[PDB]
């Protein structure tokens, strides 16, 4: 089979199609038109976008395909280095850091993060309890405040104090600007053109702001003494069982940058989309709120109670199905192979997995794919293999998945226990694309049920 390809622009090939504010949504529309696979070419680059479970289930075979750094990840590697998310599987520091940090995400470790997650969640609840009559909530803004504070505290015992601020923390301003610059480089035909000198100077400044915070985090800890048993503790003291080695100092700094970014951005999108879908689907909101009231019987949730918020967990997975907030990942062929019995690939050929489109495969989910129905997730064994991939694949899947879902279930459960919510503007979904996806401008009103936190 010859695969289709979207419209071209002479020698720029397909690259101008991604010169848009919303490239993932542009790629979803191409997939809608062209189907389960299309060729995408740019000057000096070829990739193939996959959208069907039929093909992606083959692409997830780790004996045939390994993680590729997309151009986005390659440009982010200029400040995330060989941290876990921007390392190749074959670099020594990938497996070393993977082995050292996996126990920081055990369910036992989650039991230890729980109290600090509650600390920040209570700050969010108190903020909303303290709003005056007919004031409203800026939803992604507050969810980002929460997820940033949670990864700083839980992981590094650093307080960003986001709920004390209107303007984002300087780290965020620089992080956002550095991520946007990295992604802008994709469209630059002549990146050494002097027109980009200011962009380059600004990029170095933003990387320095980020690295200054990492130095502060490391110096604060080395003063305090090893007595926090958190992520930084393992980054500073853990030894890889295979090599016997600890992480070196340069790699630790890259991990701190990696986790501060990865540990907050897509989780804030997930919580924002989950609240969006609940207020748009009030029967679902009512069922989730009934579960919260029944389970969360104490002034703050326990670790076990969060594990018992089954339906809330289903709500989160169904929000990840429609808007997976880390919406793509890239693979390369380890050897010559044939995809789907129809598309021969050579060793080194690249693939992109377009996760939001995979999650709309009607052969898997039925024709009602656009509807919000958490009950699709009642049973993992009823979901075909590789049909649902919001956390990636295989040994390169998200190391933070359980942290993200514990945090999001805790927070959404407390939100549903403590407030009734109103979609007072009849909000029209507008999805902003950065490193992640978020519903821009999403606002609600939250009426307190007046249930105390002490
Ligand atoms: C709802 C929230 C999240 C989503 C949807 C998400 C999604 C993903 C995806 C799709 C990947 C694979 C990327 C690729 O193959 O290129 C990944 C990897 C990773 N994520 Fe997440 N993530 C989330 C939360 C987190 C959190 C909370 C952390 C840290 C606490 C984290 C840290 C990482 C890291 C370090 C990797 C690289 C893992 C490796 O390759 O060894 N993520 N994430
Ligand atoms: O593939 C990634 C990188 C996604 C990173 C996902 N992520 C987030 C957190 N962890 C992982 N972008 C997509 C979409 C895109 C295209 C052009 C410009 C910008 C974006 C692509 O290049 O096709
Ligand atoms: C896949 C984790 C998100 C991330 C974090 C830092 C740098 C690149 C990607």
Nearest CA to ligand 3 atom 3: 262
Of ligand 1's atoms, which has the minimum distance to the CA of residue 270? Answer: 1
Instruction: Kindly give the distance from the C-alpha atom of residue 73 to the centroid of ligand 3, in angstroms, as a whole number.
Output: 7
Partnered with residue 330 across adjacent β-strands are: 68, 352
Q: What whole-number distance in Å separates Cα of residue 14 and Cα of residue 8?
A: 5
Q: What whole-number distance in Å separates Cα of residue 180 and Cα of residue 431?
A: 16
The residue to mutate among 87, 263, 326, having the most atoms of ligand 1 within 8 angstroms of its beta carbon, is 326
Residue labelled with tokens 């024709």: 367
b/e map 345-369, b = 16+ CB within 10 Å = beeebbbbbbbbbbbbbeebbeeee
Whether the CA torsion 126, 130, 133, 137 is positive or negative: it is negative
68: nearest Cα among 88, 47, 43: 88
Nearest CA to ligand 3 atom 6: 258
User: Residues annotated as binding site for heme?
Assistant: 398
Strands 350-354 and 45-50: parallel
Q: What whole-number distance in Å separates Cα of residue 446 and Cα of residue 421?
A: 5
Instruction: Kindly give the distance from the C-alpha atom of residue 86 to the centroid of ligand 3, in angstroms, as a whole number.
Output: 7
Q: 10 Å Cβ neighbour count for 183?
A: 18
CA angle 129, 131, 137 (to 5 degrees): 95
Q: What is the 3-state secondary structure (H, E, C) of the chain?
A: CCCCCCCCCHHHCCHHHHCCCCHHHHHHHHHHHHCCEEEEEECCEEEEEECCHHHHHHHCCCCCEEEECCHHHHHHHHHHCCCHHHCCCCCHHHHHHHHHHHHHHCHHHHHHHHHHHHHHHHHHHHHHHCCCCCCCEEHHHHHHHHHHHHHHHHHHCCCCCHHHCCCCCHHHHHHHHHHHHHHHHHHCCCCCCHHHHHHHHHHHHHHHHHHHHHHHHHHHHHHHCCCCCCHHHHHHHCECCCCCCECCHHHHHHHHHHHHHHCCHHHHHHHHHHHHHHHHCHHHHHHHHHHHHHHCCCCCCCHHHHHCCHHHHHHHHHHHHHCCCCCEEEEEECCCEEECCCEEECCCCEEEEEHHHHCCCHHHHCCCCCCCCHHHHCCHHHCCCCCCCCCCCHHHCCCCHHHHHHHHHHHHHHHHHHEEEECCCCCCCCEEECCCEEECCCEEEEEECCCCCC
Q: What whole-number distance in Å separates Cα of residue 308 and Cα of residue 210?
A: 38
* Ligand 3 pocket, residue 80 CB under 6 Å: yes
Instruction: Kindly give the distance from the C-alpha atom of residue 219 to the centroid of ligand 2, in angstroms, as a whole number.
Output: 33
Q: Which two tokens stand for residue 256?
A: 């701190």
Q: What whole-number distance in Å separates Cα of residue 319 and Cα of residue 388?
A: 12
* Ligand 1 pocket, residue 74 CB under 6 Å: no
Q: Which two tokens stand for residue 319?
A: 């929000």
Nearest CA to ligand 3 atom 9: 85
Exposed/middle/buried for 250, CB within 10 Å: 0-12, 13-18, 19+?
exposed
CA angle 274, 407, 440 (to 5 degrees): 35
275: nearest Cα among 140, 81, 153, 141: 140
Instruction: Kindly give the distance from the C-alpha atom of residue 85 to the centroid of ligand 3, in angstroms, as a whole number.
Output: 5
Instruction: Kindly give the distance from the C-alpha atom of residue 241 to the centroid of ligand 3, in angstroms, as a whole number.
Output: 25
Contacts of 130 (CB under 8 A, 6+ apart): none
Contact between 372 and 378 (Cβ < 8 Å): no
* Ligand 3 pocket, residue 85 CB under 6 Å: yes
* Ligand 3 pocket, residue 76 CB under 6 Å: yes
Nearest CA to ligand 2 atom 9: 326
Strands ordered across the beta sheet of 443-448: 137-138, 443-448, 419-422
Q: Which two tokens stand for residue 449?
A: 């049920």
Breaks in the chain listed by the residue before each, with C–N > 2.5 Å: none
331: nearest Cα among 73, 6, 1, 131: 73
* Ligand 3 pocket, residue 258 CB under 6 Å: yes
Of ligand 2's atoms, which has the minimum distance to the CA of residue 47? Answer: 23
The angstrom resolution of this structure is 1.7
Residue 433 phi, psi dihedral angles, 5° rounding: -115, 125
b/e map 84-111, b = 16+ CB within 10 Å = bbbbeeeeebbbbbbebbeebbeeebbe
Of ligand 1's atoms, which has the minimum distance to the CA of residue 73? Answer: 16
Q: What whole-number distance in Å separates Cα of residue 245 and Cα of residue 386?
A: 34
Exposed/middle/buried for 116, CB within 10 Å: 0-12, 13-18, 19+?
middle
């Amino acid at each position: 089979k010859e695969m289709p390809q979207p419209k071209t622009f002479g020698e720029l090939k397909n690259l101008p199609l991604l010169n848009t504010d919303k490239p993932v949504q542009a790629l979803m529309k191409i997939a809608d038109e062209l189907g389960e696979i299309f060729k995408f070419e740019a000057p000096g680059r070829v990739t193939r976008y996959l959208s069907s479970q039929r093909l992606i289930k083959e692409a997830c075979d780790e004996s045939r395909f390994d993680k590729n750094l997309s151009q986005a990840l390659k440009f982010i590697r200029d400040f995330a280095g060989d941290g876990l998310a921007t390392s190749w599987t074959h670099e020594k520091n990938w497996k070393k850091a993977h082995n050292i940090l996996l126990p920081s995400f055990s369910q036992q470790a989650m039991k230890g993060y729980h109290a600090m997650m509650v600390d920040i969640a209570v700050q969010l609840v108190q903020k909303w309890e303290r709003l005056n009559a007919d004031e409203h909530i800026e939803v992604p803004e507050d969810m980002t405040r929460l997820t940033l504070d949670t990864i700083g505290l839980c992981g590094f015992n650093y307080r960003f104090n986001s709920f004390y601020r209107d303007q984002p923390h300087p780290f965020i301003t620089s992080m956002v600007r550095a991520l946007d610059e990295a992604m802008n480089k994709l469209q630059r035909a002549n990146p050494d053109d002097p027109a980009y000198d200011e962009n380059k100077r600004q990029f170095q400044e933003d990387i320095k702001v980020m690295n200054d915070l990492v130095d502060k985090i490391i110096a604060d800890r080395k003063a305090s003494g090893e007595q926090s048993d958190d992520l930084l503790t393992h980054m500073l003291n853990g030894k890889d069982p295979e090599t016997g080695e600890p992480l070196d100092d340069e790699n630790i700094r890259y991990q701190i940058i990696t986790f501060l970014i990865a540990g907050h951005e897509p989780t804030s999108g997930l919580l924002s989309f989950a609240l969006y879908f609940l207020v748009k689907n009030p029967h679902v909101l009512q069922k989730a709120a009934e579960e919260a009231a029944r389970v969360l019987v104490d002034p703050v949730p326990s670790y076990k109670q969060v594990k018992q918020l089954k339906y809330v967990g289903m709500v989160l997975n169904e929000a990840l199905r429609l808007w997976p907030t880390a919406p793509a990942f890239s693979l390369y062929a380890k050897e010559d192979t044939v995809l789907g019995g129809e598309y021969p690939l050579e060793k080194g050929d690249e693939l992109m997995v377009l996760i939001p489109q995979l999650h709309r495969d009607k052969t898997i989910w039925g024709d009602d794919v656009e509807e919000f129905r958490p009950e699709r997730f009642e049973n993992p064994s009823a979901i075909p293999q590789h049909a649902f991939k919001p956390f990636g694949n295989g040994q390169r899947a998200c190391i933070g998945q359980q942290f993200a879902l514990h945090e999001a279930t805790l927070v959404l459960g407390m939100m549903l226990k403590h407030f009734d919510f109103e979609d007072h503007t009849n909000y029209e979904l507008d999805i902003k694309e950065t490193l992640t996806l978020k519903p821009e401008g999403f606002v609600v009103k939250a009426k307190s049920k007046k249930i105390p936190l002490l």
